[PDB]
Amino acid sequence: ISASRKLQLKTLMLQIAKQEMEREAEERRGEKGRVLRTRCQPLELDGLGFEELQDLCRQLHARVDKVDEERYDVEAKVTKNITEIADLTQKIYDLRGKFKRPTLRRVRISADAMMQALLGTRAKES
Amino acid sequence: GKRQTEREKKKKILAERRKVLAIDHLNEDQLREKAKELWQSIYNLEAEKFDLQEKFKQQKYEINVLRNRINDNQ
Amino acid sequence: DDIYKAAVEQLTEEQKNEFKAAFDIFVLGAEDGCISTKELGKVMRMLGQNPTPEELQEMIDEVDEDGSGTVDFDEFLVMMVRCMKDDSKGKSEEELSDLFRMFDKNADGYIDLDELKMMLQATGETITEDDIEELMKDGDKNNDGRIDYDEFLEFMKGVE
Amino acid sequence: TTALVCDNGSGLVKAGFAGDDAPRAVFPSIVGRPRHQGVMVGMGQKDSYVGDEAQSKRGILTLKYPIEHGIITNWDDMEKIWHHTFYNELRVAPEEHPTLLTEAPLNPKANREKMTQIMFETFNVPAMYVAIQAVLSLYASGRTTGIVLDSGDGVTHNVPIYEGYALPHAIMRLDLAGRDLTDYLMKILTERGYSFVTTAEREIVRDIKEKLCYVALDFENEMATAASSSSLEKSYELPDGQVITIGNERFRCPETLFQPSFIGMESAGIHETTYNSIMKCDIDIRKDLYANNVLSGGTTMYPGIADRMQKEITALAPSTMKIKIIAPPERKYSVWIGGSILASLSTFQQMWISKQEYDEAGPSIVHRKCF
Amino acid sequence: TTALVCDNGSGLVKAGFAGDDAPRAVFPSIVGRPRHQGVMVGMGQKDSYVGDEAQSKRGILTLKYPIEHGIITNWDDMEKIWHHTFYNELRVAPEEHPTLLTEAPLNPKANREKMTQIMFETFNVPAMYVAIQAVLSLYASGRTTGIVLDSGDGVTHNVPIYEGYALPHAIMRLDLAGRDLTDYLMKILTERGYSFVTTAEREIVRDIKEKLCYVALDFENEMATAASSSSLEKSYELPDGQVITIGNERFRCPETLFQPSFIGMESAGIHETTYNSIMKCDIDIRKDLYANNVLSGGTTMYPGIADRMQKEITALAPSTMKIKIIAPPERKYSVWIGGSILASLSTFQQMWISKQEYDEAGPSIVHRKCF
Ligand SMILES: Nc1ncnc2c1ncn2[C@@H]1O[C@H](COP(=O)(O)OP(=O)(O)O)[C@@H](O)[C@H]1O
Ligand SMILES: Nc1ncnc2c1ncn2[C@@H]1O[C@H](COP(=O)(O)OP(=O)(O)O)[C@@H](O)[C@H]1O
Ligand SMILES: [Ca+2]
Ligand SMILES: [Ca+2]
Ligand SMILES: [Ca+2]
Ligand SMILES: [Mg+2]
Ligand SMILES: [Mg+2]
């Protein structure tokens, strides 16, 4: 039939996909929160001797330095991936630039104003 | 000095993400507070690493998509 | 225009007679109920305007499914409401790309007919396989069984 | 909001909102004060009719164009033209719309700086950008290479571009254009008895040129044919009767483009300045420029020019290269269509000269990075 | 896993996986930044086109080779070339593949150490090994003795080998190669009127040299013949038309190899440095080296060189010895084929410079036992 019902079907698909993306993102956020809570070792900061407290804090600082190094490495890797995918997008545009520029739609002059002027209030859609 | 820049940046991060720490002149409460600072910093680093993992997954997927599109374009 | 067309579409067929009467009020002398380039030019000149007949025939061909260059009654309504343009920017490119990227469950960089079937089943709206076939035809330009990202944009072109 | 794509030009001001197909309002750029005395009282007689209003009362006015050759010679009149364009032909206050003017290549700096100063102080636009009239005409063709010959009404310029990299050392700007052809036609019409002198009758001669003149494929054969038969003599009715018959003045007026020695100019025709502009380019992009020669501007609308120019260049160029001349039917508004496309781009949205930037560096900002 | 047999070369980078017959991707090693301004917005213009992409946009670039004479003079550009080679021409991440670079004899140490440091730090390969470019060309011929003359595009070197024992005191490295022949051809073409100056037109002169030039069997007779008849004048069509006719420039360009006095170099030709390299060897292996003279490298592809060189050496050598010149049809890729064979050997599998070894001794590990 016409594209009105087909357009309705397409918009329904778009809404369903958006709902699924939002749901998946929320699930990812919850899973990430739980996983992060799992990763970091809980604190045990009671009843510890003063020197024992200092030694434990030093151990925590050493582990913090280790995690800093690891996460800096991961950050550098992700930065390299970002740069490489930016280059890939550049190549994508190179293979898809040229004549593939969408154009605006302004060829139609104002028509509602003329209809109202020449017919009074008989044009109510716009 | 690009590789030297990366090495020095990393070494600074060692002395930057971890400043000069002296746990000897601090009372028990201060030691507990600093230890929790370290703990929460590590937790934040874990969060950032997880974000990086997600971003890397997206980057891989989009890179594959771009490869497919490039192959199609020819 | 198109939004107003869909909104008024929930009324009875007498509104078509009302619009025919309005067009008669404009350019009385109509006899066929279809807007050709002659009548459109005449009514716009009476208004004080002049749209190109190339635009009119392009609008005729865009909705032309049987290739007749003419309009059925509801097709006449569609052509009549095509005289104005409101669908600007076609929703949002980035969100559409995100949705298309989430569509690829197998992450093969394409959307095959099976993924389309699964998504339609997830939608749940009253559909027929004919609608699915039409969607696949409008989406898969090269008929390779998959949807290209450029082909996905073309299929989602002018879509809010 | 939407951007205003104005295009001053010289002879026709073309304007309209960005994102459409054709300019909204196209009207001659002439400002004519009345010259007689005026005896009716209370008739509501204004002191200056601008735009298309002065093409209807031209019988008692002294029309004078405010733009001579690309450059602007009378700033008050140009300001009046801009004010009319904004307020009466588009009816949009400039306080809420970016503007995209156009300027010929190799023009004086002071002209461009004064243009931006006016747009920022008098009309008080949010942001304006000035673009070279040939790059837009290349946008409209949907290409990215090619050498574009934009023969307007003021000045004819020939900008070669490859892969988006303009070649600034190969721009050949020539000051022969439609206005000189109008004057030469008005000068050769006197050989039959018709004398047009008044600045109002220049418009009539322009109409004759537009409706009758055409470019001959071969000049000598046409001169010989028109001197023996009478199959060329086309008649035309003046605004008062007394039809006139144009003989071999038909193809002699636009022939001046290919032989500027007719009006005493030394330089070579538009058929040879294009070849010279190509030969200044590098040796490896000459094939692409040969294959993508683009025509634009109003004066390139003569019937039969896209064949004469191709024949001439094929005569000049090496025999192996293919010579192709792109002549879209929408030639006249090609620059403005390209301007609309450029203003509608997302990547271009941060190149505008924002007002705070002008406040910090003065009008000389236009020559800076924001070109 | 499989090994990556890269071969930097100077003029053409040849790479491919170990165990095949021909390199997978062969492309010029040039990195050219754009030099003009660029007016089209959003065209997606990059800042440096490397490899074979810059041989198609060379009309608006300034190509510059990152390797002058074997040695590497611009490390950033060389890193860019390697990155392109790994990621776009082979599409294999280097984290999972050993690499086998090649290096000319008698090159500066710092070049080799920097090469290994880059390969281990930036690309982070598992293990890399550097091999002399002549031993590989001897591998590809399936011999185990012989004196190989590897006249590349950067540098011509002549390594004699007997029974697998290289003779380090008899390597004669000469810096005349294909690039100097291109420059000399570009310099003698000016004697007819054709002037090539731009760094892009050097590529056109290189194409002329490849397609037309040949080595004369006897120089004086050819000079006399080309000066009387006209049977030698071969024409060639430039990238834009205007065919050119090369006369006795055909065999005068590659004659520079046998008379380096043409370009002002003092040393003796490639016909006499081979004989000198042989005479430095011991008295008992000279017959075998005479009988197994091997040619390799790109520049030894001139039509008629395997006869001129044999005639010259037979003139120099004692009359009893047999002079034989091995000129396989796959001369250009001989070094890379040999590299593939060497990387495919089981006995060689423990000679790689493993990463832990580099971590313990620094980049100076390459001069050590792992050569
Ligand atoms: N159909 C036509 N045939 C011949 N000449 C024309 C035609 N239309 C316009 N011209 C000439 O071109 C001029 C208009 O050129 P135009 O492109 O408007 O200049 P600008 O670049 O200043 O806008 C007029 O002065 C007229 O002489
Ligand atoms: N068919 C040919 N005829 C003559 N000269 C050639 C031919 N092919 C290549 N050359 C010359 O050899 C050079 C390529 O040499 P090559 O062996 O690739 O050097 P490298 O040792 O750096 O790889 C080119 O610059 C060219 O001048
Ligand atoms: Ca129909
Ligand atoms: Ca899929
Ligand atoms: Ca498809
Ligand atoms: Mg113009
Ligand atoms: Mg080599």
Curated annotation (Swiss-Prot), chain A:
The record marks C40, C57 as: Involved in TNI-TNT interactions. The keyword Acetylation applies. Residues 1-39 are annotated as: Involved in binding TNC. The keyword ATP-binding does not apply. The modification Phosphothreonine is found at T11, T38, T89, T103. It comes from the Eukaryota. Disulfide bonds: none annotated. Residues 89-110 are annotated as: Involved in binding TNC and actin. Phosphorylation by STK4/MST1 alters its binding affinity to TNNC1 (cardiac Tn-C) and TNNT2 (cardiac Tn-T). Phosphorylated at Ser-2 and Ser-4 by PRKCE; phosphorylation increases myocardium contractile dysfunction. The modification Phosphoserine is found at S2, S4, S110, S126. One of its GO terms (cellular component) is sarcomere. GO terms for molecular function: actin filament binding; calcium channel inhibitor activity; calcium-dependent protein binding; protein domain specific binding; protein kinase binding; troponin C binding; troponin T binding. Keywords: Acetylation, Actin-binding, Muscle protein, Phosphoprotein. GO terms for biological process: cardiac muscle contraction; heart development; intracellular calcium ion homeostasis; muscle filament sliding; regulation of cardiac muscle contraction by calcium ion signaling; regulation of muscle contraction; regulation of smooth muscle contraction; regulation of systemic arterial blood pressure by ischemic conditions. Troponin I is the inhibitory subunit of troponin, the thin filament regulatory complex which confers calcium-sensitivity to striated muscle actomyosin ATPase activity. Interacts with TRIM63. Binds to actin and tropomyosin. Interacts with STK4/MST1. Belongs to the troponin I family. This is Troponin I, cardiac muscle. It comes from Mus musculus.
Curated annotation (Swiss-Prot), chain B:
One of its GO terms (biological process) is positive regulation of ATP-dependent activity. One of its GO terms (cellular component) is cytosol. GO terms for molecular function: actin binding; identical protein binding; tropomyosin binding; troponin C binding; troponin I binding. The modification Phosphothreonine is found at T5. Keywords: Acetylation, Cardiomyopathy, Disease variant, Muscle protein, Phosphoprotein. The keyword Signal does not apply. Residues 1-11 have a biased composition (Basic and acidic residues). The keyword Phosphoprotein applies. Heart. The fetal heart shows a greater expression in the atrium than in the ventricle, while the adult heart shows a greater expression in the ventricle than in the atrium. Isoform 6 predominates in normal adult heart. Isoforms 1, 7 and 8 are expressed in fetal heart. Isoform 7 is also expressed in failing adult heart. Phosphorylation at Thr-5 by PRKCA induces significant reduction in myofilament calcium sensitivity and actomyosin ATPase activity. Belongs to the troponin T family. Troponin T is the tropomyosin-binding subunit of troponin, the thin filament regulatory complex which confers calcium-sensitivity to striated muscle actomyosin ATPase activity. This is Troponin T, cardiac muscle. The lineage of its organism: Eukaryota, Metazoa, Chordata, Craniata, Vertebrata. The gene is TNNT2. The chain holds residues 209 to 282 of 298 of the full protein.
UniProtKB/Swiss-Prot annotation, chain C:
GO terms for molecular function: actin filament binding; calcium ion binding; calcium-dependent protein binding; protein homodimerization activity; troponin I binding; troponin T binding. CDD domains: EFh. Ca(2+) 2 binds at D104, N106, D108, Y110, E115. Keywords: Acetylation, Calcium, Metal-binding, Muscle protein, Phosphoprotein, Repeat. One of its GO terms (cellular component) is cardiac Troponin complex. Ca(2+) 3 binds at D140, N142, D144, R146, E151. Ca(2+) 1 binds at D64, D66, S68, T70, E75. Residues 15-50, 51-86, 91-126, 127-160 form the EF-hand domain. The modification Phosphoserine is found at S97. PROSITE patterns: EF_HAND_1, EF_HAND_2. Pfam families: EF-hand_7, EF-hand_8. GO terms for biological process: cardiac muscle contraction; diaphragm contraction; muscle filament sliding; regulation of ATP-dependent activity; regulation of muscle filament sliding speed; response to metal ion; transition between fast and slow fiber; ventricular cardiac muscle tissue morphogenesis. Transmembrane segments: none annotated. InterPro entries: CALM/Myosin/TropC-like, EF-hand-dom_pair, EF_Hand_1_Ca_BS, EF_hand_dom. Troponin is the central regulatory protein of striated muscle contraction. Tn consists of three components: Tn-I which is the inhibitor of actomyosin ATPase, Tn-T which contains the binding site for tropomyosin and Tn-C. The binding of calcium to Tn-C abolishes the inhibitory action of Tn on actin filaments. Cardiac muscle Tn-C can bind 3 calcium ions per molecule. Domain I does not bind calcium. Belongs to the troponin C family. This is Troponin C, slow skeletal and cardiac muscles. It comes from Mus musculus (Mouse). The gene is Tnnc1.
UniProtKB/Swiss-Prot annotation, chains D, E:
Keywords: Acetylation, ATP-binding, Cytoplasm, Cytoskeleton, Hydrolase, Methylation, Muscle protein, Nucleotide-binding, Oxidation. Its EC number is 3.6.4.-. It catalyses: ATP + H2O = ADP + phosphate + H(+). The modification N6-methyllysine is found at K80. InterPro entries: Actin, Actin/actin-like_CS, Actin_CS, ATPase_NBD. The modification Methionine (R)-sulfoxide is found at M40, M43. GO terms for cellular component: actin filament; cell body; filopodium; glutamatergic synapse; I band; lamellipodium; synapse. GO terms for molecular function: ATP binding; hydrolase activity; microfilament motor activity; myosin binding. It comes from the Eukaryota. Oxidation of Met-40 and Met-43 by MICALs (MICAL1, MICAL2 or MICAL3) to form methionine sulfoxide promotes actin filament depolymerization. MICAL1 and MICAL2 produce the (R)-S-oxide form. The (R)-S-oxide form is reverted by MSRB1 and MSRB2, which promotes actin repolymerization. Monomethylation at Lys-80 (K86me1) regulates actin-myosin interaction and actomyosin-dependent processes. Demethylation by ALKBH4 is required for maintaining actomyosin dynamics supporting normal cleavage furrow ingression during cytokinesis and cell migration. SMART domains: ACTIN. The modification Tele-methylhistidine is found at H69. It is found in: Cytoplasm, Cytoskeleton. Actins are highly conserved proteins that are involved in various types of cell motility and are ubiquitously expressed in all eukaryotic cells. Belongs to the actin family. This is Actin, alpha cardiac muscle 1. It comes from Mus musculus (Mouse).
